Amino acid sequence: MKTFRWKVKPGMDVASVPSVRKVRFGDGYSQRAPAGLNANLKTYSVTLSVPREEATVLESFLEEHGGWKSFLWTPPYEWRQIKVTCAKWSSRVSMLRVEFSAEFEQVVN
Amino acid sequence: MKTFRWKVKPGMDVASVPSVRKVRFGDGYSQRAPAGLNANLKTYSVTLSVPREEATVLESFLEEHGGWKSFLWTPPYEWRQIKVTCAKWSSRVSMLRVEFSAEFEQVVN
Amino acid sequence: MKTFRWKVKPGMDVASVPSVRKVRFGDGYSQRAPAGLNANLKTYSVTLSVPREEATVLESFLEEHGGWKSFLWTPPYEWRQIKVTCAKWSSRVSMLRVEFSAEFEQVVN
Amino acid sequence: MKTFRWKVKPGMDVASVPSVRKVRFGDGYSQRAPAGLNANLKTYSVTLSVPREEATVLESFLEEHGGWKSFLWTPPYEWRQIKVTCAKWSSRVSMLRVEFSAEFEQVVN
Amino acid sequence: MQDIRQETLNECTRAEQSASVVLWEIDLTEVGGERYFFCNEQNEKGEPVTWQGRQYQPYPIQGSGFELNGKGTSTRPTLTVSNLYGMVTGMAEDMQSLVGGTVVRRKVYARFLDAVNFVNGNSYADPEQEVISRWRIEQCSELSAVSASFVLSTP
Amino acid sequence: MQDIRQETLNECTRAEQSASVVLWEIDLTEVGGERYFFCNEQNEKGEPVTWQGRQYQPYPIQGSGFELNGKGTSTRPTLTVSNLYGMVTGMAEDMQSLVGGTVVRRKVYARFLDAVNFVNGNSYADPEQEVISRWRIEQCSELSAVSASFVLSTPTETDGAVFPGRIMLANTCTWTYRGDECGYSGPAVADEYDQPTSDITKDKCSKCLSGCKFRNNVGNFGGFLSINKLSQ
Amino acid sequence: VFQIVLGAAAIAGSFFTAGATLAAWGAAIGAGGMTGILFSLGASMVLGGVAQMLAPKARTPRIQTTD
Amino acid sequence: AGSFFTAGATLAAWGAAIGAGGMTGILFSLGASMVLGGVAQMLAPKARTPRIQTTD
Amino acid sequence: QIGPAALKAVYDMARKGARDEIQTQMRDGGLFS
Amino acid sequence: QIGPAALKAVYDMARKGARDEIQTQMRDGGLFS
Amino acid sequence: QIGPAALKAVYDMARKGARDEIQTQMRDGGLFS
Amino acid sequence: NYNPQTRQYSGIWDGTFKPAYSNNMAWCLWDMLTHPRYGMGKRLGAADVDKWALYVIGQYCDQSVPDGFGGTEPRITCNAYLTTQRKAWDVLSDFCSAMRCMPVWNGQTLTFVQDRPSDKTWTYNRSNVVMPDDGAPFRYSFSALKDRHNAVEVNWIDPNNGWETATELVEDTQAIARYGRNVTKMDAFGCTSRGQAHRAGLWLIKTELLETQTVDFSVGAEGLRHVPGDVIEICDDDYAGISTGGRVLAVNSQTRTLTLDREITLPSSGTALISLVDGSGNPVSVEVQSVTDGVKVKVSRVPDGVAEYSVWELKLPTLRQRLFRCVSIRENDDGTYAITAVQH
Amino acid sequence: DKWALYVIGQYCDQSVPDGFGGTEPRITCNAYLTTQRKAWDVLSDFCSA
């Protein structure tokens, strides 16, 4: 299955952290390069809240890909569909709902 | 594009920690030297709060530079234009606004 | 410039931690010596609050010495003028005032 | 001077952690021996509250000893005079009073 | 000094430079195989990196230990590659573990890459800007279900 | 046991003792330099520590690796010193990296220091209470804009030596010119290229038979002028 | 931020490992972009002599008591 | 040979527990170390020969 | 980290490094260990 | 753990491990270091 | 300290210590490595 | 184009070897390396060995030097008779120690670096090299006291008395009065003339006495221009008490003047030179006329296209060059190169 | 240290049973060193005799 349909409530964290090659010379001078060839990928600290019955469906979706594999997702940040992978998806059960916390990492693949 | 033209929130940190040459064995005589020529280049922990529409523009500006490619900036601290570089610029996307947490380290080249 | 004129408001940390030579023998006996020859130097965890227009002067004063070099200061602890060096001086900006947190280390030099 | 004649605040910690010889491989049979003869010398986390004027006298007393040179003290805990040594004695200098935080580790010699 | 073109020397001294791409070639023709071209990265269009008209396919590859020292022991670099999907394994069972082949390493500034690599093209594209070094495979030091490490040596 | 005075042994056994001050002396007089005296600390009056009437200038200096072991390799201590303000650098370019000099280390209890060091004086001041050790500089291991590290060695250090050392050669003298074995005391005759000279500052022996003949010293020639044909 | 590049005063006693204080590097344990523990080859290359770094010091046969 | 695959497994769960008394780390597989002299050295002890003498 | 196990791991890593360096010095230039 | 103090300990443990490995290789099979 | 990065540093320090110990043993008493 | 009997070269070589008997030791080494039957020709092979480096080496070895008996003599010569089977590294090292060269894999060919008086290739100041946390851009080390040999016994083979091992003793009695007396033995590989053995021993002694210090000064991305054996200059502003290098902040071609960091002091007598970098990496050097304050430097001529934040160096008449030859260059998987060098 | 060698020579001069019926000095020279060895080798040989 390809697309992620659930929605993220609280306000996520979108961390970029570009990789650069940096050399620090002597009296205050330096030398910087973009290191890589294709931008930075960015990662989203996503949290879902779902009813106790749909949590099984969400778990099945996140377990089918199983750490590897990528799914399509349109983040509510730039509204540009991207390919992402999830590898942790911790989940806390409650009386009537389940709260998922996960880290979606964008991948070129 | 070469001038960060956004406004920063009231509470921002400015760390200096200059670079000096220290010689001290145990707790005896100590000798200190100014080390390089551009001793302290500071660091500003800048925070911004912007509507969800301009978050895309701010992130595009920060991502195009991508760690390298210093840009001009006038901090509200000394009001003197300097050249700075950003490397992390995390973001958090609330219901109506988004907050940016970036670090600006000023450079010479 | 030689003398520090600004004043410290809240109550600072005055840490002594003298250096001693200690040997621990067997059944509870030991052997202690003062290690050095001239006392312990003692350090002050100083914090200033200044109007936003005077923070530039304070930073100029703290940057002229730049980690090395010493300035005279009379601590509001013993009221004896001492020679101190500052090496970090973190600063936090606000709407109308700037708060400096610094560590002054007493030096014989 | 050889006796600490100041008064300590209510909250004071007394740690013992005696010194023993333990032999136990994995989680099998274990053997314990009393190790030395002067098993535990304890440790008192002493806190004092003194007016700003007598802080000078307190620090002169704690500084002349300078880590070595144990001094006599009667803790309010067992009311038995012992010989103790101090090594840190940090201080906070408030508007009207000063708080001393010191560690008294008792000795034998 | 190495005989390298003036454009590379001009780029080396700039404060803000482009990314230094490293392109690898494995030549087993002398030992009865083919030539495989690799690059650790794709390009901005999600395609294998085109250098001098030749496509270098994306594959996790990383070399280390490269140095020029005359005194003492001859330098032995190392090259780590991805053995996921059992590709290198297939090479090990067909070429006597790649022993005796050649490894060619090119350092090229990304500014001099062919214009096809970038959406907006490359005005400073120059196929003659590269630094080439040849080594030989001495031993496939490790081959596992994940990665594969090869020892290199001077010819 | 070491021959140290009874006062030092009395101080060593005390539970609460004075600080042990280590004083250093660099002696480059045998290699054409001067003598420098250093201590890691000043005294309570902000002055260089005075020991036995001699001032030891304050300078960051620290030694390590000092031990007495007969088995195995000869002990090689290390001495790290501050190179701020380019001071040791100035010695490295003037004394051939200080190599061949002497390093003298004294351990003295601070209670025995000279009375001038303390404001209230020293009633137990005793200039005869010290422990002395001598070493030689073998190599300036590192010298940078911050510090300088020297390798020290025992003066004996039979590392590069051989025994017996005198070598049997023909057409070459192994003696030292105007030395004891050479036994020459005449006027200037020639230089190392056999060219005649009346200049005493340019008078050297070629160490060949002709050089010896120039001085009529063939009797004291250090070579053996027949072995070149018996070795065939 | 920095490159440590250990020399000789650092390895011979930890007197100048704390001279640079190794603070930000140790807090960042290094990086994937850059490597620490460079271990400058100054004194190691010169142990045999300066003339050994320019020529390979040709060898000689073992001395035999037969001759 | 380079910390390229020490982070391949990321060592996170083991490093956070430094190890255990039940189990040991740093196993250091002896694959390439035992094969340095050759495969024939892992099966036979490579009989020695006397030093060549110039007298002969 | 706890000191005991860390020290043991450092000791085994040091042994492995020493063995690798010894086997490296037995090559052509080296030191012949 | 502060790096400056730990590096000396790691170096000295490496020295001890190297000496132990050298003495081990001087045994029968070994490598004679 | 993350283990993956620290293990390479420990290995390199061990290599340096092994080289230093080997060069030390080639001195007079030593073991001649 | 080489005549072995007269040991002369006509003009440019172009390659294209020729089968003539010669005593040139560079080409004896070439035969040892690239012979398919008995040498290393099956392995290795041609196009892996730098023939031009060996050409220059043989030219150097063919130069005439004083014989010591009154005449002249070729500098370095063969006449070895290799009978025992030794490892190829042993024979290569004897060949490369008889003529003072070190073989290193350049990256495309195996080159040989010969100890010769060479001109500086590049200059590095403290603003062009990597700064570690400690303020030591350049680290200097020195050779030990017992590693400065002043007496050598060279074993050559005499063809006059009889083809037997003659020992020639070389000494430097001045250094024996400073660094004790460090004596060694050495085997001159191809020597059959007393002059060549004495020259080899004297070269060893002179190198140990003159060349003393080494430097580690790991640099930025420019290091890919360096091969081992390159001679460079180090303008260490801390080794000297003055500042003689930095970066250019602004260039004013009209009314020619330059802005630099730090402050420059003119010498009392003589014309100081400033080395800037052209608009195409050519490092021309020009003459300074006067300096205002300590920054505004007026030069005789502003080179074309001198960009801002470009490296400038200062050459004074009373300052030594301090040349260093590279012996090792290491890539740091970072973009920086770790360079080791020794006095020149 | 000349005094240490003095005591050592005194110890080496002591008379001990010869094994044939008479007496004999404890430790003695009569070496003839012809080859050139490192000074450490000769010193260790002397200090092991």
Ligand code: SF4
């Ligand atoms: S050759 Fe004669 S004059 Fe010259 S040093 Fe020898 S003994 Fe003296």
